[model samples]
Target: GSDKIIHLTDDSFDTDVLKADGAILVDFWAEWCGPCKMIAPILDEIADEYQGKLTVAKLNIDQNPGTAPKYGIRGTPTLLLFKNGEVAATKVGALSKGQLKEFLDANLAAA
Candidate 1:
């Protein structure tokens, strides 16, 4: 479900991403973030490949400052893997498709 990426906002971040069931990969980004844009398509592809088994979501840090700050996100394109309502992994930079999948697989396996 490449087209099924969850577009998160401040209002829905906690309930949708943080409190989600099973595994979740959240890309913390903003419209103006160049690196975030660069990795957007890679995330979409990964989201499609991992559909049904994981939740792939994107949160706009510019609009969701409240949750972003709480997570200590100091940069854009911070990918966080959450499981059972807790953070299991964090990658704070743009990543290639292979790296993203590797991170997801490792974190989900560990979770």
Candidate 2:
């Protein structure tokens, strides 16, 4: 489905996020996080809206602790924007659809 969100794990983090060519938005979240749940729909919308322009994915901290710890993800709902295999920006909190769009637009350059 075009609206579906990709689930990322520690094993796929490097290949899917780090080695990605364009812009990537990774949401570091845990199952028990309320804010993470709150933003899931927003992320889905962003995923569909951005489509080919950017990659939006979610990494469960509980299942993929390796990458999360490496990035010092002490809290859930941490959003990291990666460009050219590196972190371009990071936001540690829940965000609305509008806010998410602004962040994505600012980070992802026109290709």
Candidate 3:
């Protein structure tokens, strides 16, 4: 696991992500999801690049059963951006590094 990325569990989801200030990116993934593996390095890099402006976190859907359902996460590699304790954006599937960065920049620049 990368030091910049925060591994979150159901118990810590609210306190760590939801209630946190600024923008927080939560990656919802599963152990068997290949797409998640493809996006891991990209996310780590984003975590590093957006170190001060955003928070990058991951929740293993299988391990943390309670959180995914609450967010209606039916797919692997679901990305939810939370701002001010609410969901600001939702993205699913694996995106390329450039595409992902564009998405983040667009969202972050808006507010």
| Per-prediction TM-score to the true structure, in the order listed | 0.92, 0.90, 0.96
Residue-level lDDT of model 2, residues 21-97, one tens digit each, is: 77888889988989999898888888887888888888998887789889878898999988888888898888888
Per-residue error (Å), model 1, residue 79: 0.6
lDDT of each: 0.84, 0.84, 0.91
Instruction: Please give the ranking of all candidate structures by lDDT, highest first, separated by commas.
Output: 3, 1, 2
Q: Give the higher-TM-score candidate: 2 or 3.
A: 3
Which 10-residue span in candidate 3 carries the lowest summed lDDT?
Answer: 102-111
Write candidate 3's Cα lDDT for 22-98 as tens digits.
89999999889899999998998899889999999999888888999899988999999999898989999999999
Scored by TM-score, the top model is 3
The alpha-carbon RMSD values of the candidates against the true structure, listed in the order shown, are 1.5, 2.0, 0.8
Off by over 4 Å in 2: 1-3
Cα RMSD for predicted model 1: 1.5
Clashing pairs in 1: none
Arranged by TM-score with the best first, the candidates are 3, 1, 2
- Model 2 steric clash total: 0
Cα lDDT of model 1 by residue, 41-101, tens digit: 8887877888888988888877777888888888998988888889888999888888887
